[PDB]
Structure 1
Amino acid sequence: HHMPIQVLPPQLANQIAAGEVVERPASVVKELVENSLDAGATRIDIDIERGGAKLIRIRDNGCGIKKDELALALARHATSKIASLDDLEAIISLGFRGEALASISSVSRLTLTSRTAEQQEAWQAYAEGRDMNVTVKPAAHPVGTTLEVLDLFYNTPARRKFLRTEKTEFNHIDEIIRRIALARFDVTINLSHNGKIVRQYRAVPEGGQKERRLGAICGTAFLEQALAIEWQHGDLTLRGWVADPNHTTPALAEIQYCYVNGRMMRDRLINHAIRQACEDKLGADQQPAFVLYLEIDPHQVDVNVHKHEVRFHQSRLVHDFIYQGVLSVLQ
């Protein structure tokens, strides 16, 4: 009670928010790449420097951001993805909170450059000062967008001390891209570190062969033991690959990716049902290797938990669904 209840200034408020949204360089990559995806990009190019502690540049060939909305994109609680509660309950995009860019900009030197198809001119924007005032100025850029994040945590020292080695931080970034690339086979994703190419996942044309990308992302080892899955029942449909439990090594066990309507996730309900389907067919219980995609009525699952967490309205039903699907294929 000694200090009055007082509104937190823009920058400070965003930095506090950044504490949750910006865990490490990998977090920034995730947020930006997901924005490119929402913007309908077909190709995303990612350049990293020193594990991302020095630089993170992500360019996409998405639809871009209109000049008069650049500042809004750097603003808090402002989005183009939902306008009401209905939109949220049945969301189509990955984003909707309208907080990511604002948060990131408050704890780094973030530059937003973009041009829409209707604009002849490209523009660049960035916020500054305790009030996060935005400067918009001329720039050069093709249809699409480029986010440039420099000196992450430069103005938040307590956090900068927690940054691990360049090697460790880049690895988390590599892992993040790995999870996103598996979610969208139709999107070309290139990742580079310190001026050198680390990877590039070619987009798979309509109906093209996926085994190619799967192997490129997860490795040939997984690709060989990969058992495809096709299991449906109304709104519930399970797809993907499950490695033969009998031929699953701990190295392959590193591949445990699950998705709910394209949204990457790590839910215990699912990991359990799978390990159950394997333990029940196989002899011993162990860490299975898989890449599964669950399609379900968006109204039967909560995506606003805070991101890899989700909540299923019919917990039991879903769990048994996945269990059967995997169990079935394992036999």
Structure 2
Amino acid sequence: SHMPIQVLPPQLANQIAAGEVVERPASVVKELVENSLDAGATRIDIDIERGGAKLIRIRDNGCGIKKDELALALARHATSKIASLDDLEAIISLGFRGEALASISSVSRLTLTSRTAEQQEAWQAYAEGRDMNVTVKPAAHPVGTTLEVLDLFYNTPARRKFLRTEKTEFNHIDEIIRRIALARFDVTINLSHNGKIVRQYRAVPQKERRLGAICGTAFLEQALAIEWQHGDLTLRGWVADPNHTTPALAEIQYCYVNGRMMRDRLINHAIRQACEDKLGQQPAFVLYLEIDPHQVDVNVHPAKHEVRFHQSRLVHDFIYQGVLSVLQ
């Protein structure tokens, strides 16, 4: 009570938020690419420098942002994706908090360059200072958006110390893009590090090509396609033969909830109870769960790392049977 209850300064409040949603450079790449995805992009170019500690650039060929909404694109709690509780409990987009760009801007030097098909001119914008004041100025750019995040954590020096080696940090970025590339086979994604191209995923409107290109040939050889459907619950993807799964292959344990990369304990357990009951070790897989958004809650973690299902036992059993069925 010595200190008066007071509203935190805009930048500091955003930095507090940034600590919860932006752990490392990979986290920045994750949010910006998901933004690009929500914008209907079909091609995404990601340029990384020094593990992302120096620069993180993401360009997409999405619908872009309107000149008079760029500042809103950087303001707290501002979003174009949802506008009510009804929209929230029926999420149909990767973003919905309207916080990512604001959090990231407060902990780096972020620039937003964009143009819409209806605009003849392009514009760039950036927040700045204790009050996160926004500047919008002229620019040259194609229809679409380019995000530039430089000096990550430069104003929160203590967080930078948690940064691992550049190589390590890039590996986490590379892993994120992997997870995202598996989520959207229809999107072309190019990733470069230090001027050199590391990968270029080709869009698929046979996914076997990309699957192998992303997870390796080893997985593709052991991969068993899945097609499981009940009421409105659907399970797709691939599961490897437990008897022919190695520790290396076990590093591939990806699951998605309505196209959103998730890491659910309920899902993994269901999948294991199936490989255990059959084999009689750690399974390798790439599963996609499709469900009515009303039956799942994705507003549990600020980074969307978790989800909770309204009918927990029903969903678990659905995946169990689904996997178990394929193994036989």
TM superposition score category, shorter chain reference: over 0.9
1:188-239 Cα shifts (integer Å, max 9, x gaps) = 010000000111110102xxx1000100110001011000000000110100
The 2-side partners of 1:84 and 1:325 are apart by 35
Q: How many residues align?
A: 325
Aligned identity (percent) is: 100
Cα deviation, residue 158, structure 1: 1.0
> Following the alignment from structure 1 to structure 2, what is the Cα–Cα distance between the partners of residues 288 and 228?
14
For residues 234 and 127 of structure 2, what CA distance do their matches in structure 1 show?
44
2:298 aligned with 1:297: no
Alpha-carbon displacement from aligned partner over 1:292-330 (angstroms, at most 9, x marks no partner)? 001111111101111220001111111111000100000
Q: CA deviation at 1:291?
A: 0.2
DSSP 3-state at the match of 2:71: helix
Q: Matched residue of 1:73: which SS?
A: coil
CA RMSD of aligned residues (A): 0.6
Match of 1:189 in 2: 189
Question: Is 1:226 aligned to residue 228 of structure 2?
Answer: no
TM-score by length of 1: 0.98
Point out where structure 1 has 5 or more consecutive residues left out of the alignment. Answer: none
Over residues 154-189 of structure 1, what are the superposed CA-to-partner deviations in whole Å (9 max), with x where a residue is unaligned?
A: 000111111110011101101100110000000001
Q: CA deviation at 1:138?
A: 0.5
Asked whether 1:38 is paired with 2:29, we answer no
Task: State the shift of 1:91 in Å.
Answer: 1.3
Deviation, 1:42, is: 0.3
Alpha-carbon deviations, 1:254-283, whole Å to 9, x = none? 000001110110001110011110010112
Superposition map of 1:70-89 within 5 A = 70-89=70-89
Task: List per-residue Cα deviations over 1:24-69 (Å, max 9, x = no partner).
Answer: 0000000000000000000000000000000000000000000000
Q: Tell me by how many angstroms 1:74 deviates.
A: 0.5
Using the TM superposition, give the Cα deviation of residue 107 of structure 1 relative to its aligned residue in structure 2, in angstroms.
Answer: 0.5
Q: Where does residue 244 of structure 1 map in the other structure?
A: 241
Q: How far off is 1:142 after superposition?
A: 0.4
The SS at the match of 2:152 is: coil
Q: Distance in 1 between matches of 2:300 and 2:210?
A: 30
Listed one character per residue, the Cα deviations across residues 112-149 of structure 1 (whole Å, up to 9, x for unaligned) are 00000000000000011111111100000000000000
Work out the CA distance in 1 between the residues paired with 2:106 and 2:234.
41
Q: TM-score, normalised by structure 2?
A: 0.98
Deviation above 2 Å: which 4+ runs of structure 1? none
In 2: Cα distance, 1:303 partner to 1:216 partner: 30
1:41 & 1:250 partners in 2: Cα distance? 35
Distance across 2 between alignment mates of 1:5 and 1:166? 41
Post-superposition CA distance 1:235-257 (Å, at most 9, x none): 10100000011100000000000
Residue 21 (structure 1) shift: 1.1
State the partner residue of 1:308.
Answer: 305
User: Secondary structure at 1:323's aligned position in 2?
Assistant: helix
What is the aligned partner in structure 2 of residue 148 from structure 1? 148
